[PDB]
Design a binder for these strands. Structure first.
Ligand SMILES: Nc1nc2c(ncn2[C@@H]2O[C@H](COP(=O)(O)OP(=O)(O)OP(=O)(O)O)[C@@H](O)[C@H]2O)c(=O)[nH]1
Ligand SMILES: Nc1ncnc2c1ncn2[C@@H]1O[C@H](COP(=O)(O)OP(=O)(O)OP(=O)(O)O)C[C@H]1O
Ligand SMILES: [Mg+2]
Ligand SMILES: [Zn+2]
Lengths: 86, 99, 97, 50, 76, 89, 48, 122, 166, 34
RNA sequence: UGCUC
């Protein structure tokens, strides 16, 4: 008959097989660097819309100095339907 | 005997009794006779107010033995019940606060 | 309990509930079947809709959305049994107003 | 009932609102007639008709 | 103004119960009771005197509502 | 009329009762408890507390009877009281 | 000094939303894992 | 117990002083034993805030003076926070406006300070 | 100091019906929001006024009078740049312990921006010479119940000169 | 001990089919229901 | 199971 267990099995049981190490070479490193560059450059892209901040505490003279300025891309309204114009 | 039919739709309650019936034409149609024995067991919680303060004082002074009376007192501040069979019932009657 | 030898109380069967409904006495029916029989105060979490304990929801590991609620004990037993059957009743509470 | 050994139940409400609702809606004087056809059920019986 | 001007038995019962509970909870009396130790009797006296400060809020099935005073309604 | 308000004569049996009513708790309490409960769990049908049986089960005053309406207190008050004026604004 | 937190609210249940729980939600809801098939101990106290 | 807007409208210390005085007089005119025993933190906070506002120069203020000061500062294109601070502090010295008051660069002009002092002192 | 709009369901028992509804509502709201800090709002002082007060219901339960009241209340919540005047109610090695006058002992100015002669040797020494001013910097709140304070804020003391007191 | 008077005269006296441990000096109901 | 109604 099967024996009784006093404590539950470990949350992460150990395994004798480990993951195969990653492939090495200039190609993999270049792809990694390019993916990191894409991560870094695609957040500042106008397509990356951020959450509109709201509930400003007060208005100040330094506003014009701290006013975030960023160019906005103009969608082609010819291809896009009319329901998306502001 | 399921939960819906046995414990939700119809369930047992307290403050109730079951007794045999007998005829008595001397009572009104809207009146029913209750025995003293059952009357001393089924209790009703009355709130001490400015109107029935003296009646409840007298009921507490009577005690659980005499038919007109009470069995337990629950204070307004603390919810610790007090049994009237023990202790000085007069001191409890004199200290009946509103509520 | 059921029997007199067991110090049991009377039973308001389904027909008694039907009569009370026909009379329309809602408060009397509530006091009989809820207040004086199996009244209890449970703690329900307004986020997941599950039952908590001592003002704490072990599911979400929080206590800000936990609120007290009056309920018949048989109804809580039914909810627990249904949760045991994988039928999870999610309670969405709201103000009485 | 026929007073031949029948056991009847007697319940005591534990709330003023329930008490008032029982006295008003379930009052004996307010239910002298049945809702089936309006005929009066609470009337004279044997030893009263004779 | 479109509902029945008569005060139903259910409204009577609920108003009497609420007033009895309030009086049992140390509420002021507006009829100068004369040795009435039962709150329900005081509530019935206030109803017969038409001095219960309660306004019924009758709700229509669609959602509309209307207020009716106890002294404004008709009792039987 | 209750048997002929959906355009079809529906009987009082469990089938017609299910076709007419919508509350899950009432159908589960009447007949076919496990079947109806599992069907509702699968459909995820949210059941309201508008019916009478569910009000009795959950321990809340039923909508029928004295609970159809609400009561208001005739307290001495003044709706929309005067507001303190703002000096700085 | 002291934070404002509501003591009790007159919450009224609106409706019951039936559904199902995934094994992960079952693990999250549960507190302990039952793995012993026996009920009581070997000692004479027979503690669980 | 939710809030709709935590920054609905800013108010100076004079409004708070008037509200505290009104609450204090209504309390001493309608003092209740059980209501006071239930929560005594109200009395403490009210009295201590009133004493704090009394320690400040907030006294000798009236709605007409506040309106006149606001109308006088409206011509100085100053922000609401600056005038709020000037009214709550009532600076008698110039250094208080030169350095302590924020947004000093390009706003003092070395000539408007005299007008600000004459207005706040009047 | 700033006004805050709130909506509260106030429950008045039946033994307060002889009193005016508005006065009782104001008293209850003051008793419920006295010396308490509402999260992300600040420490409420007292009730300013009551704007909207709709019908008063009576539930079939407790039987009391429940009223949904919209009101405006005053709360102490700087705007991250307000200037205050407090008194030094102690001092610690890592930072002085200044408190607004009998208002709240929660202002903990960090000593990391004054001229480079800043240190506290536990003898209540404020600062080596070359009514205490305070410049609020940031607000911060935290919860309390986490098992079956809340307002400190940072204070700034720049080179204000202070010709009156060093 | 009794929570009100602090006495130790706690007796288990069933009052009409109601098991109740109550103080025997002042009558403060210590525990009730089983 | 026996009953009581
Ligand atoms: N003396 C006695 N006999 C009983 C009782 N209940 C059932 N029986 C007998 O057992 C037979 C029916 O058994 P059930 O009543 O179905 O037993 P059960 O309800 O499955 O048993 P439990 O689930 O343990 O209550 C009948 O022929 C009865 O004679 C009882 O309470 N007392
Ligand atoms: N199985 C049962 N279900 C419901 N009620 C019952 C049952 N058995 C008895 N009763 C109660 O007893 C009453 C039956 O009496 P009834 O049949 O009218 O007279 P009887 O027993 O024929 O007497 P006679 O033989 O005519 O002298 C009515 C009912 O309330
Ligand atoms: Mg018979
Ligand atoms: Zn949760």
């Amino acid at each position: 008959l099967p024996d009784v267990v006093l404590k539950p099995p470990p949350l992460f049981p150990d395994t004798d097989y480990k993951p195969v190490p990653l492939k090495t070479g200039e190609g993999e490193e270049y792809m990694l660097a390019l993916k990191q560059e894409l991560r870094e450059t695609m957040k500042r892209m106008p397509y990356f819309i951020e959450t509109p901040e709201e509930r400003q505490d007060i208005e100040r003279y330094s506003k014009r100095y701290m006013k975030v300025y960023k160019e906005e891309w103009i969608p082609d309204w010819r291809r896009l339907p009319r329901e998306m114009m502001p | 005997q399921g939960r819906f039919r046995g414990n939700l739709s119809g369930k047992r309650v307290d403050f109730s009794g079951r007794t045999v019936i007998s005829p008595d034409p001397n009572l009104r149609i809207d009146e029913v006779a209750v025995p003293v024995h059952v009357a001393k067991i089924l209790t009703f919680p009355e709130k001490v107010n400015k109107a029935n303060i003296n009646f409840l004082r007298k009921l507490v002074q009577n005690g659980p033995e005499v038919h007109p009376g009470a069995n337990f007192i629950q204070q307004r501040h603390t919810q610790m019940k007090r049994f009237l069979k023990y202790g000085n019932r007069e001191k409890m009657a004199q200290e009946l606060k509103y509520g | 309990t059921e029997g007199r030898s067991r110090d049991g109380g009377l039973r308001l069967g389904e027909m008694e509930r039907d009569c009370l409904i026909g009379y329309g006495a809602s408060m009397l029916l509530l006091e009989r079947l809820m207040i004086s029989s199996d009244a209890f105060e449970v703690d329900v979490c307004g986020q997941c809709g599950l039952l908590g304990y001592s003002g704490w929801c072990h599911y979400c590991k929080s206590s800000c959305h936990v609120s007290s609620l009056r309920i018949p004990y048989a109804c809580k037993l039914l909810f627990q049994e249904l949760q045991s059957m994988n039928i999870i009743p999610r309670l969405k509470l709201s103000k009485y107003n | 009932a026929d007073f031949d050994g029948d056991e009847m139940n007697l319940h005591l409400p534990q709330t003023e609102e329930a008490k008032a609702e029982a006295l008003v809606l379930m009052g004996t004087k307010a239910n002298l007639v049945t809702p089936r056809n309006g005929e009066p059920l609470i009337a004279a019986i044997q030893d009263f008709l004779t | 103004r479109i509902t029945t001007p008569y005060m139903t038995k259910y409204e009577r019962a609920r108003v009497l119960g609420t007033r009895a509970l309030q009086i049992a909870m140390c509420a002021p009396v507006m009829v100068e009771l004369e040795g009435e130790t039962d709150p329900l009797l005081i509530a019935m006296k206030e109803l017969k005197a038409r001095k219960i400060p309660i306004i019924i809020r009758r709700y229509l099935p669609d959602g509309s509502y209307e207020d009716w005073g106890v002294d404004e309604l008709i009792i039987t | 009329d209750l048997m002929t308000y959906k355009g079809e004569v529906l009987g009082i049996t469990r089938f017609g009762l299910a076709k007419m009513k919508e509350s899950v708790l009432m159908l589960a309490s009447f007949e076919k408890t496990a079947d109806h409960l599992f069907d509702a769990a699968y459909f995820g049908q949210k059941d309201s507390v508008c019916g009478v049986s569910e009000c009795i089960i959950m321990g809340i005053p039923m909508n029928i009877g004295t609970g159809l309406f609400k009561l208001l207190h005739k307290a001495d008050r003044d709706p929309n009281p005067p507001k303190r004026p703002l000096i700085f604004d | 000094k002291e934070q404002f937190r509501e003591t009790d609210v007159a919450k009224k249940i609106s409706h019951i939303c039936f559904g199902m729980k995934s094994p992960e939600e079952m693990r999250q809801q549960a507190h302990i894992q039952v793995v012993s098939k026996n009920l009581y101990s070997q000692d004479n106290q027979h503690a669980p | 117990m939710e809030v709709k807007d935590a920054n609905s409208a800013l108010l100076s210390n004079y409004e708070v002083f008037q509200l505290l005085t009104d609450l204090k007089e209504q309390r001493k005119e309608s003092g209740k034993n059980k209501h006071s025993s239930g929560q005594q933190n109200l009395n403490t906070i009210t009295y201590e805030t009133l004493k704090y506002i009394s320690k400040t120069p907030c006294r000798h203020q009236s709605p007409e003076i506040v309106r006149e000061f606001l109308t006088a500062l409206k011509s100085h294109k100053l922000t609401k926070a600056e005038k709020l601070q000037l009214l709550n502090h009532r600076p008698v010295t110039a250094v208080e406006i030169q350095l302590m008051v924020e947004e000093s660069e390009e706003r003092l002009t070395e000539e408007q300070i005299e007008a600000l002092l004459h207005t706040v002192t009047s | 100091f700033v006004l805050v709009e709130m909506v509260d369901t106030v429950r008045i028992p039946p033994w307060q019906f002889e009193r005016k509804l508005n006065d009782s509502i104001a008293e209850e709201l003051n008793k419920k929001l006295a010396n308490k800090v509402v999260y992300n709002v600040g420490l409420c002082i007292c009730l300013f006024d009551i704007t909207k007060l709709e019908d008063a219901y009576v539930f079939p339960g407790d039987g009391a009078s429940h009223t949904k009241v919209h009101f405006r209340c005053v709360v102490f919540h700087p705007f991250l740049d307000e200037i205050l005047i407090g008194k030094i109610k102690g001092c610690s090695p890592e930072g002085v312990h200044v408190s607004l006058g009998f208002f709240d002992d929660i202002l903990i100015p960090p000593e990391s921006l004054q001229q480079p002669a800043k240190f506290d040797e536990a003898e209540q020494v404020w600062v080596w010479e070359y009514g205490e001013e305070i410049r609020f910097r940031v607000v911060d709140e935290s919860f309390v119940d986490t098992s079956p304070y809340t307002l400190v804020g940072s204070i700034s003391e720049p080179g204000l000169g202070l010709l009156s007191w060093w | 001990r009794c929570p009100d008077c602090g006495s130790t005269e706690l007796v288990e006296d069933s009052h009409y089919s109601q098991s109740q441990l109550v103080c025997s000096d002042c009558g403060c109901v210590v525990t009730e229901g089983v």
